């Protein structure tokens, strides 16, 4: 019905790339580099003042990048953030809280 606190990793989707794919941008100038396609492969949702995100992206090569984008609610103007990321983060890195 509506499991909140993070939860186990759901698979990434067209909205959890979409996420990626919307901070990926956010993530060049708020890192120090230039990331690539964020193939998203699993991605942890959870509940609070709208829906924090967690994912575990492909970051193009073999390596990975975690995600935390915080979603404010549907209100036009801006939408959704770029809470966070660990970048260099490898697949073994389970995503867990962040």
Known sequence: ??????????????????????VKPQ???????????????????QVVAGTNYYIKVRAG???????????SLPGQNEDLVLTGYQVDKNKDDELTGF
Do not use: C, R, W
């Open 27 to 45: 993530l060049e100038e708020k890192t120090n580099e230039t990331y690539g396609k964020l193939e998203a492969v699993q991605y942890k949702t």
């Open 61 to 71: 090569d073999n390596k990975y990048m975690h995600l935390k984008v915080f979603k």
């Open 1 to 22: 019905m509506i499991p909140g606190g993070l939860s186990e990793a759901k698979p990434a989707t067209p909205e959890i790339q979409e996420i990626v794919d919307k």
